[PDB]
Amino acid sequence: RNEEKAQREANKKIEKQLQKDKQVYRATHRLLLLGAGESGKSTIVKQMRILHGIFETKFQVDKVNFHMFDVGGQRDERRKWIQCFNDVTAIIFVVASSSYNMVITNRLQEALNLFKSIWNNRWLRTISVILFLNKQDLLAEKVLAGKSKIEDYFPEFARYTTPEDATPEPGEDPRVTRAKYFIRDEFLRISTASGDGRHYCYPHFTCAVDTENIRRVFNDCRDIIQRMHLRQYELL
Amino acid sequence: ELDQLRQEAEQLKNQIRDARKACADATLSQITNNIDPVGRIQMRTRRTLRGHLAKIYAMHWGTDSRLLVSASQDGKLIIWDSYTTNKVHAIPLRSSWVMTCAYAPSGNYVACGGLDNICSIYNLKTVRVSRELAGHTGYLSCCRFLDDNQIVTSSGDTTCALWDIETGQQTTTFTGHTGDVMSLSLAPDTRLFVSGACDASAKLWDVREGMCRQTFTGHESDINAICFFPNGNAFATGSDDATCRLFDLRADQELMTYSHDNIICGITSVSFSKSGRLLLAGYDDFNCNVWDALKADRAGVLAGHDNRVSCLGVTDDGMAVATGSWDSFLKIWN
Amino acid sequence: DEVWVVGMGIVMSLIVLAIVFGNVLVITAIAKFERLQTVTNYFITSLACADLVMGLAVVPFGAAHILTKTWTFGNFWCEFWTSIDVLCVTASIETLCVIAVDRYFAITSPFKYQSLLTKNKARVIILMVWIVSGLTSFLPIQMHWYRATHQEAINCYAEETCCDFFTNQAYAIASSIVSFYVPLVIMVFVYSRVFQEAKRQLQKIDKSEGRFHEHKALKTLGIIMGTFTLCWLPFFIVNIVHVIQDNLIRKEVYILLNWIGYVNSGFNPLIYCRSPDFRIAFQELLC
Amino acid sequence: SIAQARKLVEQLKMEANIDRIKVSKAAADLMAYCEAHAKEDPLLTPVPASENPFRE
Ligand SMILES: Nc1nc2c(ncn2[C@@H]2O[C@H](COP(=O)(O)OP(=O)(O)OP(=O)(O)O)[C@@H](O)[C@H]2O)c(=O)[nH]1
Ligand SMILES: CN[C@@H]1CCc2c(ccc(O)c2O)[C@H]1O
Numbered sequence: 001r002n003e004e005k006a007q008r009e010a011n012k013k014i015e016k017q018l019q020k021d022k023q024v025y026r027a028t029h030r031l032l033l034l035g036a037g038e039s040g041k042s043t044i045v046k047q048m049r050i051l052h053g054i055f056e057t058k059f060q061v062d063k064v065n066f067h068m069f070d071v072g073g074q075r076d077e078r079r080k081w082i083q084c085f086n087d088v089t090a091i092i093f094v095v096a097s098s099s100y101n102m103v104i105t106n107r108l109q110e111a112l113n114l115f116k117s118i119w120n121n122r123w124l125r126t127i128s129v130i131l132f133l134n135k136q137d138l139l140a141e142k143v144l145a146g147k148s149k150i151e152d153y154f155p156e157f158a159r160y161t162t163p164e165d166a167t168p169e170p171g172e173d174p175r176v177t178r179a180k181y182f183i184r185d186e187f188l189r190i191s192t193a194s195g196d197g198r199h200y201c202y203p204h205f206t207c208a209v210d211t212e213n214i215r216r217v218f219n220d221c222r223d224i225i226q227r228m229h230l231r232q233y234e235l236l
Numbered sequence: 237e238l239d240q241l242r243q244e245a246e247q248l249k250n251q252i253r254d255a256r257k258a259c260a261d262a263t264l265s266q267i268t269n270n271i272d273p274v275g276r277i278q279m280r281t282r283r284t285l286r287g288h289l290a291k292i293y294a295m296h297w298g299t300d301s302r303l304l305v306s307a308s309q310d311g312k313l314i315i316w317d318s319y320t321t322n323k324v325h326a327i328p329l330r331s332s333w334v335m336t337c338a339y340a341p342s343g344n345y346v347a348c349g350g351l352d353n354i355c356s357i358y359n360l361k362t363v364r365v366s367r368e369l370a371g372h373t374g375y376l377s378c379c380r381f382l383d384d385n386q387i388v389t390s391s392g393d394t395t396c397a398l399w400d401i402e403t404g405q406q407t408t409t410f411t412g413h414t415g416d417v418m419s420l421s422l423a424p425d426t427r428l429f430v431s432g433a434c435d436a437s438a439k440l441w442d443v444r445e446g447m448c449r450q451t452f453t454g455h456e457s458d459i460n461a462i463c464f465f466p467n468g469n470a471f472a473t474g475s476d477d478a479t480c481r482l483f484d485l486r487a488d489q490e491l492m493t494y495s496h497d498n499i500i501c502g503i504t505s506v507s508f509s510k511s512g513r514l515l516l517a518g519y520d521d522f523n524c525n526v527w528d529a530l531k532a533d534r535a536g537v538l539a540g541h542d543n544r545v546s547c548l549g550v551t552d553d554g555m556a557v558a559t560g561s562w563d564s565f566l567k568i569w570n
Numbered sequence: 571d572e573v574w575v576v577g578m579g580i581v582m583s584l585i586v587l588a589i590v591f592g593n594v595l596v597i598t599a600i601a602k603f604e605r606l607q608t609v610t611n612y613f614i615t616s617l618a619c620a621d622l623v624m625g626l627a628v629v630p631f632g633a634a635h636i637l638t639k640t641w642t643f644g645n646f647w648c649e650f651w652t653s654i655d656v657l658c659v660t661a662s663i664e665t666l667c668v669i670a671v672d673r674y675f676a677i678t679s680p681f682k683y684q685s686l687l688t689k690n691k692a693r694v695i696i697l698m699v700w701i702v703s704g705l706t707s708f709l710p711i712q713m714h715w716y717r718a719t720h721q722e723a724i725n726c727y728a729e730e731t732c733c734d735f736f737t738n739q740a741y742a743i744a745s746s747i748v749s750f751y752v753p754l755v756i757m758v759f760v761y762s763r764v765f766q767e768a769k770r771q772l773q774k775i776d777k778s779e780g781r782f783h784e785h786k787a788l789k790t791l792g793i794i795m796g797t798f799t800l801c802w803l804p805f806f807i808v809n810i811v812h813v814i815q816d817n818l819i820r821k822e823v824y825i826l827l828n829w830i831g832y833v834n835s836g837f838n839p840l841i842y843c844r845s846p847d848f849r850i851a852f853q854e855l856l857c
Numbered sequence: 858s859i860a861q862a863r864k865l866v867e868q869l870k871m872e873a874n875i876d877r878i879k880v881s882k883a884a885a886d887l888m889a890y891c892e893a894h895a896k897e898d899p900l901l902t903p904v905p906a907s908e909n910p911f912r913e
Contacts, residue, residue, distance in 0.1 A: 027684070198618070209608070222680060226680045229680060234786070235768050
């Protein structure tokens, strides 16, 4: 007789604990950090780390809790560790934009292939991607009076011209702007090929010095959630 | 000289294939043709368990056919009571990613692992962490309690190991696979176990000897789940090409294949019944199917889940079957 | 003569049947499946329940009164019928206001939507709306505070076979303000803000990516504001004008507009239940 | 990595010397076991609700 009462009390306690934990589970937002090797993924986290087999990082922005999960120690050409990440809010992609000359095949081509594989994955059909184009000043140094040229490694650069809607940063030559926008459009072509209106991409330009990486991620996550809510009610 | 060694290996494969083909006296369907079919089978839900905040990947029935355990991605293990549909324990985790769980044969210990390369064991009656086993270089996929003082595990680094709880150091390490290993099953007498890797190959191991005995390469894609026949002389596998094949230890080749032209989804779980007549397999089409072992004829469908099925188990007494899905719900069928 | 009275019965019965069927189907579809048990789906459930109650209660009695041209029930039953009408009409609009406010909070406050809205708070809101709707219907109609003073009203009240709607200016203004005019400006402001946000997001997407790659927003907002406005606007204007100055609006026009208002019942399921999940649920059963 | 190759050859050599039986005998054994244990499968044979523990 008393066994039923004891089980009922235990069930009530467990239900209370689960109800308490549900709020904190729903409050936080989860992000995934994926990058190819030599990317800078490590440097970016510590600056974010300096401010407020697996790695977890906690940081709060405007009373909103974000949690970031580097997956590491498992280098796989084929990834089966990606079916578990279909509920994340956004995916942060880091690519070394200055390494088009470095030969392993090319590193930039390998990064493009990885991005194409990620974009078309079956379980990530409704996951947006935030793109960080690292190593800006190395690319500037290579482009400005450099023996190596993009023409040799990437032939279709020759037919590429600067977009009319571009907004080049002050004090830079047109050549570095052309290279940066060519790489960004090369990524955006794959982004657009099969967008289907369910998930987008947010390209960005950064360097070791920049400390705004925290504000950008927050704005992109807010935009992603707002766009998803807008699309849910058939308003976009 | 490497090409000459490759030539020698190529020659051996042909001899093994010829030896396997020489034993194909008659097909299984030809032998089993005069048996009356079991007819249509129907099952209805009896219990529904709620309380998991996220998707479920694994579950394991208890040895008394009363208790069961389940692990979800919210970072919690919950031990249920199917008779009274109420919970007994709720163990939080250090890491929120878990891919497997197991229940001790004596009902004393519970183990679980995830993306972090650590297998943790909890003492139910003392609920705190008891031992942490580390040394794998890849994510764990499945683990089974061979006894109360030793466990066998498989990871994503193309290896399987047999741990020692008291010492915490590896005892025997099995190597030979090429791709990731996702599942394993043990014989009733705990002398041999089988594993299914991602290179479309299944192997038979020896626990005591620590060496491989046989190799089966029937499938053509990734192998996700594996089950073992109650008799102890057969096993079944499920792959991503919507096919199930029943192999044989004594014959050393497959005997029957289960497939249909209206399904193009994957397979995530495979299990038998007490008598072995029924084959239960979960699919990616949000439901489950019940095959016939000796006829390859469909006999029933288990529907009711709003998302894909990622778990399956049958009690020791064979009185009910429980399924897990990404809809964060567990169901009992009878 | 007889043929004309003969005709409207068929269409009125069809209206009754459609009203009953749509809301009962929505209710059973939501109840049967656990995947639709959502916070935003409780307000729709309350709306469907209120609409079904109104369509099963007031419409047949009004049909019988119009066809027979003589109220054959007691005065208490007619008062109960009028109270049911007022309660259901009042409760069928504040639910739309609540839905609009919920959508506004969901869109304009994405990071606080989960914390602000809870399954426990939605029930409190629904009960508050229902109790305030039932406070303005039953309480002032069971008492005689709404009754007029002219001789025709008194003569009809004395007779046990006549009961029309006669009221003074105070109630005719207060009920209209509580039911329709107040929940209109809120909806207009909410939908204007939502449209502004949608236009801003579309402009941002076009600026970011439009080189490789409006009509949608208006259509959805339109099929939402215009249906309700066209259905319920004229009646809540004639309600004021025929009281502010007598001998302007005849009884026939008042009754016609009041019945035009009832036709809004059969359109809510076709507007708020067009999501693909609802289509799957409808195809699952009785299909 | 070539060193590996000899280890593979030994494994194939050890896995090729196994006695095998005709598939007819194995099929007959499976048939006999399934027929023998066919009367104790609650899933196969619908048991009366008196002994069913999940009948509410
Ligand atoms: N100029 C420049 N150099 C950088 C920047 N970030 C990193 N580097 C340099 O490039 C190196 C590459 O980053 P690592 O620290 O190796 O990061 P990691 O996570 O080990 O790199 P992966 O192999 O890509 O995973 C850094 O160690 C620095 O030497 C940057 O913003 N600007
Ligand atoms: C005759 N039927 C009544 C008349 C007055 C009235 C209605 C509805 C809502 C109101 O706020 C009202 O004042 C109608 O349903």
